[PDB]
Amino acid sequence: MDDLTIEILTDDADYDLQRFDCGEEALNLFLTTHLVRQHRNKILRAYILCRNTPERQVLGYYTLCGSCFERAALPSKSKQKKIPYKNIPSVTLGRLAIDRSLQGQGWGATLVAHAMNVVWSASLAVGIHGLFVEALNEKAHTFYKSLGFIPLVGENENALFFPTKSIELLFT
Amino acid sequence: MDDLTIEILTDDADYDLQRFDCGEEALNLFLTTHLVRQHRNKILRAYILCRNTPERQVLGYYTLCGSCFERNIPSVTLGRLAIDRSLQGQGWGATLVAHAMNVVWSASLAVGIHGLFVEALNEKAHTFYKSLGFIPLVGENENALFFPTKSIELLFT
Amino acid sequence: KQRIDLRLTDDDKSMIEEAAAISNQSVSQFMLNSASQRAAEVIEQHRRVILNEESWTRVMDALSNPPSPGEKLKRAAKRLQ
Amino acid sequence: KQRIDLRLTDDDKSMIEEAAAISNQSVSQFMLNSASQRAAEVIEQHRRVILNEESWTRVMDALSNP
Amino acid sequence: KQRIDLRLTDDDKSMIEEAAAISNQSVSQFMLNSASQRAAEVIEQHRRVILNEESWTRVMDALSNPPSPGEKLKRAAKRLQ
Amino acid sequence: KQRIDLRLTDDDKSMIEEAAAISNQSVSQFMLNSASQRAAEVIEQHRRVILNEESWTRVMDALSNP
Numbered sequence: 001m002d003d004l005t006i007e008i009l010t011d012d013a014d015y016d017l018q019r020f021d022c023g024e025e026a027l028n029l030f031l032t033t034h035l036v037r038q039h040r041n042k043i044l045r046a047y048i049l050c051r052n053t054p055e056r057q058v059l060g061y062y063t064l065c066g067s068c069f070e071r072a073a074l075p076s077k078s079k080q081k082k083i084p085y086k087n088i089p090s091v092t093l094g095r096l097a098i099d100r101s102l103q104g105q106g107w108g109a110t111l112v113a114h115a116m117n118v119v120w121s122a123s124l125a126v127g128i129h130g131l132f133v134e135a136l137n138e139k140a141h142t143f144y145k146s147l148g149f150i151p152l153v154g155e156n157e158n159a160l161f162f163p164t165k166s167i168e169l170l171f172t
Numbered sequence: 173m174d175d176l177t178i179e180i181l182t183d184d185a186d187y188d189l190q191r192f193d194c195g196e197e198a199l200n201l202f203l204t205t206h207l208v209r210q211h212r213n214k215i216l217r218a219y220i221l222c223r224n225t226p227e228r229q230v231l232g233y234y235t236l237c238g239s240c241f242e243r244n245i246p247s248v249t250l251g252r253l254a255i256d257r258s259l260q261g262q263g264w265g266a267t268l269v270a271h272a273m274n275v276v277w278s279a280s281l282a283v284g285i286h287g288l289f290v291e292a293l294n295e296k297a298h299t300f301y302k303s304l305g306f307i308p309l310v311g312e313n314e315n316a317l318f319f320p321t322k323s324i325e326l327l328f329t
Numbered sequence: 330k331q332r333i334d335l336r337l338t339d340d341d342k343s344m345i346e347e348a349a350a351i352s353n354q355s356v357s358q359f360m361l362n363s364a365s366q367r368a369a370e371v372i373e374q375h376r377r378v379i380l381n382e383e384s385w386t387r388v389m390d391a392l393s394n395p396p397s398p399g400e401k402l403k404r405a406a407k408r409l410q
Numbered sequence: 411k412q413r414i415d416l417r418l419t420d421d422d423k424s425m426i427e428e429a430a431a432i433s434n435q436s437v438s439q440f441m442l443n444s445a446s447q448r449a450a451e452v453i454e455q456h457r458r459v460i461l462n463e464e465s466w467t468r469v470m471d472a473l474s475n476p
Numbered sequence: 477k478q479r480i481d482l483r484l485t486d487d488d489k490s491m492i493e494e495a496a497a498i499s500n501q502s503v504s505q506f507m508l509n510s511a512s513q514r515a516a517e518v519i520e521q522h523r524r525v526i527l528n529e530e531s532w533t534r535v536m537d538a539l540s541n542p543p544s545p546g547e548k549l550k551r552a553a554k555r556l557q
Numbered sequence: 558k559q560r561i562d563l564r565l566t567d568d569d570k571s572m573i574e575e576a577a578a579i580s581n582q583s584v585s586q587f588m589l590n591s592a593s594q595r596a597a598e599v600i601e602q603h604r605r606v607i608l609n610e611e612s613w614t615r616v617m618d619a620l621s622n623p
């Protein structure tokens with residue numbers, strides 16, 4: 001573990017996958033088949049945290065897609081005018097996971113910093129208002145909230161937000 | 173003429189359709205260029221007030237069609253109803269509305285019918301329909317009126 | 330059976346061909362289905378009486394408290410008999 | 411002016427001939443307007459999908475190794 | 477341009493023929509148009525995030541006056557440098 | 558049991574593969590379920606329209622006479 005890197009998935013699909021275990025087999029079985037299929041279908045952008053060696057065994061990953069958000073129903077919009085805004089762009093961090101080997105070593109927060117880094121560099125190229133993340137349980141929820149993310153409540157509960165302005169701030 | 177009657181258009185197309193004139197070029201033209209075909213395409217049932225002449229001189233007409241009201245709930249609409257200038261002022265439009273109501277009523281015994289909407293072009297027709305019982309509607313429906321089937325039934329008691 | 334000869338400008342025909350191509354249909358079939366669906370839709374929209382708040386209220390009140398037939402309509406329905 | 415012919419089924423025409431009389435048009439103008447309105451519909455929806463794919467490509471290309 | 481071969485049960489085929497005749501398309505046209513439209517709307521439904529009243533409120537509040545990154549996030553940012 | 562030939566445009570197929578990957582299905586499963594549930598919708602709407610015209614002919618026979 002002297003030589004970890006985080007690269008975009010090189011589409012060739014030449015990594016070492018099944019020798020990975022993050023502690024919960026939904027993310028595991030997502031990496032098993034879903035991750036490469038959905039990366040090469042361009043539904044997500046799959047970043048791999050692995051070792052800088054020819055063998056290239058995976059120790060973590062995250063997934064970044066584009067997204068767009070919208071309110072339920074805009075009420076009482078006759079104040080002055082209404083120019084509709086229906087495709088409000090954002091980035092969504094689909095799922096993130098570290099191997100059980102590297103748990104507890106800040107590596108989830110650094111993967112988050114890397115994802116926010118890519119989101120920032122994209123914000124310079126296209127319009128992005130903020131970063132949504134999903135949290136399937138109590139622990140991912142607390143993890144994400146301890147990094148600046150704001151919790152949404154009510155049929156949006158497992159979803160937290162971090163505005164791109166504060167991402168710009170994180171890299172002062 | 174003590175010999176005039178009201179009938180369903182008998183699909184003869186054997187009526188004197190042209191010497192008719194009721195005051196409005198719109199209803200005249202509808203009778204002469206549409207009514208036979210729209211009766212034959214089942215979009216309306218047309219009833220003619222004429223006399224037992226060689227060619228059944230057309231002196232009045234009305235049309236009935238099935239409708240629904242919303243915002244399916246069944247009803248009928250008296251779309252158009254006109255009568256020649258010579259017969260006007262003598263309660264013949266009231267008689268044709270009564271006949272259309274009777275047709276709607278004898279339908280309401282076989283089919284569920286909640287009431288009868290009616291189309292009124294000018295304020296002339298609006299006052300006229302309003303005078304027979306019809307409820308004046310408002311807003312986008314200001315040019316329509318309604319009469320419940322229950323009232324049509326109370327009529328014939 | 331029957332046949333309809335139609336005249337459209339070059340640009341009308343270009344738009345019809347493009348839209349018919351997006352549908353994976355022929356130009357003829359696209360025009361036919363468009364006219365058929367729109368005619369059935371027009372026929373439905375015709376026979377429907379969309380009442381507003383107050384007209385709805387008034388028809389409901391006429392169904393709840395229906396009027397008594399008036400003198401004029403009474404004399405007419407007698408003139409029938 | 412270009413010419414395009416179409417074959418109906420004697421019932422279809424009735425429907426058209428019915429609708430053409432309601433919306434106050436000819437059978438010719440009615441069929442033409444129906445097809446052109448639907449053409450605008452199809453074309454604008456296809457442009458919507460193309461634009462969504464374009465924005466998707468922009469944002470996803472920006473999220474890849476920037 | 478391409479090709480897909482769909483092996484189809486017989487009940488489903490009778491049903492799709494019924495429906496493709498209801499829309500006066502072919503079985504091929506019906507199947508492909510259904511596939512394309514449902515694909516479009518499945519993708520549109522995946523990509524979007526509909527926020528309710530309070531979720532929308534907090535997202536707006538985060539956008540106007542954005543927070544300061546915590547010390548954990550800043551340490552994480554300094555690590556990968 | 559049976560067979561069908563379907564020809565696409567590389568924009569239909571990429572989109573259909575993406576929407577299959579989304580919903581956790583095959584492209585065969587996705588296209589089949591698409592056409593199938595759409596056929597359900599279509600047969601249902603045809604049936605409702607038939608019922609509308611049945612009630613229409615009922616009330617048009619009533620307004621003619623018994």
Ligand SMILES: CC(=O)SCCNC(=O)CCNC(=O)[C@H](O)C(C)(C)COP(=O)(O)OP(=O)(O)OC[C@H]1O[C@@H](n2cnc3c(N)ncnc32)[C@H](O)[C@@H]1OP(=O)(O)O
Nearest residue numbers: 022094095096097098103104105106107108109134136140
């Ligand atoms: C689908 C989704 O999007 S949800 C994805 C989440 N996945 C899961 O929940 C599955 C199970 N777990 C995982 O797979 C993931 O590895 C995580 C990412 C959820 C696991 O968390 P970790 O990566 O171990 O957390 P983290 O990166 O913060 O590492 C532990 C760090 O917490 C820090 N920490 C901060 N505050 C405290 C505190 N009060 N006490 C102890 N430690 C603390 C530590 O400093 C430590 O790292 P350091 O000593 O190097 O600084």
Ligand SMILES: CC(=O)SCCNC(=O)CCNC(=O)[C@H](O)C(C)(C)COP(=O)(O)OP(=O)(O)OC[C@H]1O[C@@H](n2cnc3c(N)ncnc32)[C@H](O)[C@@H]1OP(=O)(O)O
Nearest residue numbers: 194251252253254255260261262263264265266291293297
């Ligand atoms: C699109 C549509 O469907 S709108 C259809 C309406 N048609 C038109 O607008 C075209 C022109 N007019 C016509 O063709 C039609 O004949 C009507 C039906 C609109 C014309 O009205 P008519 O039927 O001739 O008159 P009506 O049937 O009301 O008979 C006149 C009666 O009004 C009665 N009346 C009641 N109150 C009054 C009053 N205050 N002052 C004068 N007369 C009165 C009279 O008693 C009189 O005849 P009566 O002695 O038999 O009662």
